[PDB]
Design a protein around this ligand. Structure first.
Ligand SMILES: C[C@H]1Cn2c(nnc2C(F)(F)F)CN1C(=O)c1cccc(C(F)(F)c2n[nH]c(=O)c3ccccc23)c1
Ligand SMILES: [Zn+2]
Length: 210
């Protein structure tokens, strides 16, 4: 079903992924409570996820999205942090696990900031942290995140995403726009699992500042 291909640290692809991961780090409102306190990652390994069935579904949907949006599928590389990596790399993203609540809408969420996704590696609010030390700011335990191909199509920009079950008419995605009375960092939402491909699996550690 799924095959992982190791990228060499000296390869252009690995370097591109690491630089996007490192450059998108930001200071979060919670002062590092959910994701830990760091200004750098120590990248352990980067793997390319190979899943035939997932690629088929992704490519088929991309063709549809572009055919609806004047031949522009608007593909974006976005981060996804989750304690359910294994399920995602084998089954893909699934909007059926999502629902309307006080924090999120019924969708598949992505960040353009790696540090935002890092806040969800151990669950909502960082859960209880690493299973070994129960520390949300663990500098030892190897963390994992995904760097995904996301078919955005025509995106709808809005201040709040909690009431969304699908994109508005003629749109394919929703973007939670940063605001003074809202989000500090952008949220990217799709409502179909076929609109994302979990391309890269990043294994890393957060680094403790000097
Ligand atoms: C239903 C879940 C789990 N989910 C999905 N597909 N399969 C599953 C699973 F049940 F198997 F885990 C798709 N899904 C998500 O996308 C999702 C939905 C709501 C909230 C979150 C999140 F809060 F946990 C989150 N995580 N990771 C981020 O990088 C992130 C970036 C910006 C904002 C919020 C977040 C994720
Ligand atoms: Zn730990």
């Amino acid at each position: 079903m799924t095959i992982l291909l190791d990228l060499a640290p000296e390869d252009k692809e690995y370097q591109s992924v690491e630089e996007e991961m490192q450059s998108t780090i930001r200071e979060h409102r919670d002062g590092g409570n959910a994701g830990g306190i760091f200004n750098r990652y120590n990248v352990i390994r980067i793997q390319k996820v190979v899943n035939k069935k997932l690629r088929e579904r992704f490519c088929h949907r991309q063709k549809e999205v572009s055919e609806e949006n004047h031949n522009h599928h608007n593909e974006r590389m976005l981060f996804h942090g989750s304690p359910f990596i294994n399920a995602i790399i084998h089954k893909g993203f699934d909007e059926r696990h999502a629902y309307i609540g006080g924090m999120f809408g019924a969708g598949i969420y992505f960040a353009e900031n790696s540090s935002k996704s890092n806040q969800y590696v151990y669950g909502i609010g960082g859960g209880t942290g690493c299973p070994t030390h129960k520390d949300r700011s663990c500098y030892i335990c190897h963390r994992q995140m995904l760097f995904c191909r996301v078919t955005l199509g025509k995106s709808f920009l809005q201040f709040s995403t909690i009431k969304m079950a699908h994109a508005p008419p003629g749109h394919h995605s929703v973007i939670g726009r940063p605001s003074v009375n809202g989000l500090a960092y952008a949220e990217y939402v799709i409502y179909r699992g076929e609109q994302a491909y979990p391309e890269y699996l990043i294994t890393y550690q957060i680094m403790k500042p000097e």
